[PDB]
Design a protein around this ligand. Sequence first.
Ligand SMILES: O=C(O)c1cc2c(s1)-c1ccccc1CC2
Ligand SMILES: *[C@@H]1O[C@H](CO)[C@@H](O)[C@H](O)[C@H]1NC(C)=O
Length: 348
Amino acid sequence: DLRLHLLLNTSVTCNDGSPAGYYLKESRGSRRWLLFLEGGWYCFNRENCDSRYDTMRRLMSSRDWPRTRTGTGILSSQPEENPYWWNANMVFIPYCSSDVWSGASSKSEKNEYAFMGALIIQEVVRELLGRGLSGAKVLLLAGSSAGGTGVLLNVDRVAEQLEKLGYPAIQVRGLADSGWFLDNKQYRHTDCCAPTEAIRRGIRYWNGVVPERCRRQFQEGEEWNCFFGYKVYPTLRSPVFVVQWLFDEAQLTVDNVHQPVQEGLRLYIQNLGRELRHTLKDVPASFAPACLSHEIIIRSHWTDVQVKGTSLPRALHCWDRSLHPLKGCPVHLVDSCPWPHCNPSCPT
Ligand SMILES: O=C(O)c1cc2c(s1)-c1ccccc1CC2
Ligand SMILES: *[C@@H]1O[C@H](CO)[C@@H](O)[C@H](O)[C@H]1NC(C)=O
């Protein structure tokens, strides 16, 4: 079990002004630290955030959080479930900011909600240094769905934060799971939502922040571009491993894809997997199976899926070795077959 701590700096809050926090299980014999960002979509105006507050309140508020959480998948402490990092210090950071982890905005007389995801990450890192993170050799910032996009937006800032605090020795890395999306045309048009327009409104609503080099490329008004993995990844300096289903359920949802499939839709889906494969061609550490699914790394059976005969925990161990061209220890694993479940190890 991972145990809840609410932030001692209570100015760093969830959407409704309640304190943010983190769940922690320490490992006294290890110098590896895993900080996992939870996902769960987002909201981009008052009406849509009010609706989220009615029926998704744990993603907006710490008031009803439980005192413990069980670690699963890469957060499990059992070697059988987590061959990769079972002996690490484990941190689960709940997503209570609805801002894809990008916001730096307080609740006030002009703001009904606080959007503080970027500051929550920085504050967790700060309070953990006093609980052992100061002795770390690797800090892996991981996340799924909106949390995976959050890794891409925040990993370089965590690294800069530790260098300026006097800890250049800690190596910061990222693991981004199911957060690599395409700003493509929808299969059938709808009213807002297309990924592009939703992010454009959210950034303004949240006062969202993006990594500095990506901001300097796209410039004022065009920062939404840095929320799209294939645009922000080349600007990053920290090592980042990318996990992405070729046919992500959330990608299909925003594309309005839901009997025998007709030619138009077949071609749309095949072109979608081809485009995803193309954006990964120059990402050296990546794992991308040809499956219709969503998230993987905190699933209890994450050990089951394979690409070219190598599982995800093995690929991540090979990545570790590469950061010390390996024989039989690959790190770039992208399926080439063109339809969902052409890979027999896909989740059922
Ligand atoms: O299921 C979740 O948590 C998320 C789903 C999506 C996210 S996050 C997103 C993050 C950046 C850019 C475009 C998108 C649209 C799809
Ligand atoms: C609390 O967090 C806010 C927002 O990041 C920051 O400005 C302030 O310095 C913090 N206070 C302390 C005592 O750490």
